[PDB]
């Protein structure tokens, strides 16, 4: 007939940083091989704006060596072609990304030693990055959600410590306020909004990868736990599709997962729904 919306998953890591762009049809159970990244990379972040998929930051961890990426690259699903864009002010391994109003927010990540608390806004219409109010905490492996046109930044790693702290950027006032910390410390968790709530799923607490999932209600300002995920996973991809959450791969201290679970809010149940062609951590994921 025709084909609807897809969960794109881009780059990642298994033995080395990867180039795989693949897509999943949640309504047919099927997986698409699509154009490889110009450069392989891991701990990048994915987002869509106006039909187009964007691949932000990360690092090429090669057999040869490794480089932290300041690169922004754009995938057009119409042409199956990547094009490069204005690079960021700085390279951002383990970046967090949110989209408010056709604009991309790159928050935190590392340039080797330097753990960032800087933040930059990219305007596709101009093809231009601009620095904005930095966060209060330095954070890499930071979950990033956009709720009621605010950017929430959740957990991460400040260079010394793993955080359960979370803050909130106000685009209109250009300022950051701390919010209720989560029950659990979570570096490299997966974070998104669904039916008006931030969810934090998986992550490394500093000892052990997690399968616990807590959600923020912005009104009651509390972090209630919900159903854990089947598999413990850190450095996982996450997205929302058809009002359900999908978690894609990641690491569990032993092996690189290929599992993808799916959370029905309506019935507070998870369920495994496919595998990825390979097991990989630190993929970037988005829907269009």
């Amino acid at each position: 007939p025709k084909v609807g919306r897809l969960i794109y998953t881009a780059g990642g890591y298994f033995r080395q940083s990867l180039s795989y762009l693949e897509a999943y049809n949640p309504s047919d159970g099927t997986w698409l091989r699509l154009a490889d990244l110009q450069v392989p990379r891991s701990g990048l972040a994915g987002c869509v704006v106006g039909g187009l998929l964007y691949a932000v930051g990360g690092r090429n961890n090669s057999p040869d060596g490794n480089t932290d990426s300041s690169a922004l690259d754009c995938y057009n699903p119409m042409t199956n072609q990547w094009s490069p864009c204005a690079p960021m002010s700085v390279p951002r391994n383990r970046i967090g990304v949110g989209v408010i109003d056709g604009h991309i927010y790159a928050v935190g990540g590392s340039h080797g030693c330097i753990h960032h608390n800087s933040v930059e806004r990219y305007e596709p219409e101009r093809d231009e990055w601009h620095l904005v109010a930095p966060m209060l905490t330095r954070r890499i492996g930071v979950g990033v959600a956009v709720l009621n046109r605010l950017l929430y930044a959740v957990g991460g790693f400040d260079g010394t410590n793993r955080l359960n702290s979370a803050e909130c950027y106000y685009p209109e006032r250009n300022e950051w306020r701390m919010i209720t910390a989560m029950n659990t410390i979570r570096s490299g968790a997966g974070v998104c909004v669904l039916h008006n709530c931030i969810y934090a799923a998986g992550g490394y607490d500093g000892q052990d990868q997690l399968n616990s999932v807590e959600r923020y209600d912005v009104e009651t300002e509390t972090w209630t736990f919900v159903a854990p995920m089947k598999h413990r996973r850190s450095a996982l991809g996450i997205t929302v599709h058809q009002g359900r959450i999908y978690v894609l791969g990641g690491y569990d201290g032993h092996t690189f997962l290929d599992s993808v679970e799916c959370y029905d809010p309506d019935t507070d149940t998870w369920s495994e729904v496919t595998r990825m062609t390979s097991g990989r951590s630190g993929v970037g994921v988005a829907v269009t």
Binding site: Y13, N61, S281, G282
Partner: peptide
């Protein structure tokens, strides 16, 4: 030589 969190080997 391993990153406990990402599972990436470094050095």
């Amino acid at each position: 030589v391993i990153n406990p969190e990402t599972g990436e080997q470094i050095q």
